[PDB]
Amino acid sequence: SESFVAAAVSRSGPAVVRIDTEQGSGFIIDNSGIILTNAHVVDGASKVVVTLRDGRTFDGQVRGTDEVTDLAVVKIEPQGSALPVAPLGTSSNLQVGDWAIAVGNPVGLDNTVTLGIISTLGEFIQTDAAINPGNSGGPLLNARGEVIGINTAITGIGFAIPIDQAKAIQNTLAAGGTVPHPYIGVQMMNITVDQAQQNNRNPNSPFIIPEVDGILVMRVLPGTPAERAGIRRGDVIVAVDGTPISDGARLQRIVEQAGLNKALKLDLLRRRLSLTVQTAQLR
């Protein structure tokens, strides 16, 4: 009698809450009052008001925030009748073209529902389910109604944090404390020989590029480990110690796998030159 959409909303929609600080959506993932949302919803504030789809309101505490993934965990006081819960799916099962249901609780008295598909996977989910404020921080449901992502506002193309990312961040955020995001601080670019010689053909390019294939430092962000290690705009990173490289993403993964406060040795041309960068926490 209902479509499958009406059904998925009937399964997970009750757990979708309104969040105000003086604004957006969240959803309860545990009968004890654990609530996921976006960090930009809760601001840097720590006191939050949670309104359930049924009208119950809760003084909820911001238990804290990952600015980088844009996730926050709120907790509320599970008094009275039991808090309803959204069942968590898994995002490593998404294919492009799978149905996507984005649910909000902007007002507090009703869900907002929009319908789309998974448009892209990276690790942001992309969907053409209309993703708008108020609806942001609410869940992205699959056809069965399992949370597979967290809507984020930021065309017809909207983004969701894949739910398995939140699953990894949940314990840490819910218990205060900082999710580690190690970085060194360079804007980088993969450099192609055709591209280095191309660049060098132009009398007005800013620097001569040493004709190789590597990682061109485009910018050294101020106050970063990379500035402190003496990296300059124009350096070409070629290998992280040992392993050669030409892929900005492979360097991303070596930095992350390294961890916080680890020296990395870097092979760069400028002249040949290796430096050590002490990873620090992205903020």
Partner: peptide, 4 residues
Amino acid sequence: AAAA
């Protein structure tokens, strides 16, 4: 253009 990526940030590491």
